[PDB]
Amino acid sequence: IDHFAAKILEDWRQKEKLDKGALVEADRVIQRLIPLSSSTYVQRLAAIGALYPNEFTENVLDLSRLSTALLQLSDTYYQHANDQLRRLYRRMYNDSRTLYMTQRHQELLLAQITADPNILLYPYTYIFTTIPTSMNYISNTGQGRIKHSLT
């Protein structure tokens, strides 16, 4: 669990950078681990990991106890108010062995397989279109009380 979590943080930070359009020297396109056999909880981490939830970018999760928050995040997505995100998370949970990845990652995997024809990469892989979400949460871990000016 701790391993999968650290890897999910690494992949999320990397994708967070890729989506900004910056050139990256990633050592590998999908940094996160793939369970081959694990318990329930690792399958949950695999699922929210592959989702690339908006909540990470907003810093809504606390990294002080990363895996815990990650588990909690899955709990919301397992019963998410959104239908698309719920069914997507469920589907990812039921096929943990598959490596879910965005189309934009997948084209990078293609460029890699083009430059090195005999490169090995994990063969069981579904390509999902990401679900947009409009809720821009404010957030800031780190000391400082907010001084609201109420309207």
Partner: protein, 292 residues
């Protein structure tokens, strides 16, 4: 020598493929009509099947007349078969691969080392086309040439459960098969299928070309689907029954998903790992011919 018609050997009444059902010799198509599928949230997309290897495994110097059809059918649908890659007599098919070989493949499903009296056998050209592909079953165990045993099952699902639109799409929801059922229905189904003379099917499949081939592919789609069905039950994660008001619906979850299971169960035939590798190979070759 048995002549091959303008259609396949399968056109001959001698080679009818028919599961027992409701006390009668039902055609596979009229069994598959009983089948119904509940969709689930998961999706199968079919990846390209890798081209089968150029290699034909050596037909080792074997004095005996190998019973090949029995070996294949038991490896695919056999209730009790295991360690199917230990003996490795599948390689023997490559004895038939050579031009003007003395060896004959009898209708009995035996590979005689030389033509012998009062044993009818398939036309050697046809068998050569058939061996040029299916001898590769003989390298189903060798590490370099093993088939993927996970992704290939997607094709199985599409070729079985898939509606024509799902087949055109190349992507269908993972499904859950069900049918009104008698006791031991899948065991009996698989045993009705082990008795099928499938080398007739595979030989017409490899020998026929042009419209005569395509006319075969439509005519025997349901047969191929029955073979695929038995394999599907062999690899299904679970196979329950449902009470439905004094009737029972057998239900397998899930079509198109290999669970990699190997512990035996009463409901259906089970694959040992060797049978998994073999079946994966068989599907590789057969689906390759089926989509060309």
């Amino acid at each position: 020598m048995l002549q091959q018609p303008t259609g396949g050997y399968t056109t001959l009444e001698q080679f009818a493929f028919t599961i027992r059902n409701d006390g009668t010799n039902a055609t596979p198509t009229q069994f598959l009509q009983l089948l119904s599928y509940e969709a689930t949230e998961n999706e199968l997309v079919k990846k390209t099947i890798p081209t089968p290897e150029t290699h034909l495994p050596s037909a080792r110097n074997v004095p005996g007349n190998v019973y090949i059809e029995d070996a294949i059918t038991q490896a695919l649908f056999g209730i009790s078969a295991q360690n199917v890659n230990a003996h490795g007599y599948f390689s023997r098919l490559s004895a038939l691969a050579l031009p003007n070989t003395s060896a004959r493949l009898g209708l009995d499903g035996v590979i005689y080392n030389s033509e012998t009296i009062n044993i009818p056998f398939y036309d050697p050209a046809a068998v050569a086309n058939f061996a040029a592909t299916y001898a590769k079953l003989g390298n189903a165990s060798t590490p370099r040439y093993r088939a993927d045993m996970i992704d290939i099952y997607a094709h199985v699902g599409l070729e079985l459960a898939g509606t024509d639109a799902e087949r055109a799409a190349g992507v269908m929801p993972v499904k859950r098969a069900k049918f009104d059922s008698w006791e031991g229905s899948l065991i009996s189904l698989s045993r009705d299928v082990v008795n099928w003379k499938i080398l007739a099917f595979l030989i017409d499949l490899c020998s026929l070309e042009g419209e005569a081939l395509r006319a075969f592919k439509t005519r025997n789609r349901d047969v191929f689907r029955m073979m695929l069905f038995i394999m599907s039950t062999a690899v299904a994660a679970n196979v329950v029954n449902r009470k439905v008001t004094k009737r029972v619906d057998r239900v397998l979850e899930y079509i198109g998903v290999n669970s990699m299971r190997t512990a035996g169960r009463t409901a259906t035939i089970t694959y040992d790992l060797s049978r998994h590798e073999f079946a994966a190979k068989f599907l590789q070759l057969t689906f390759t011919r089926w989509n060309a």
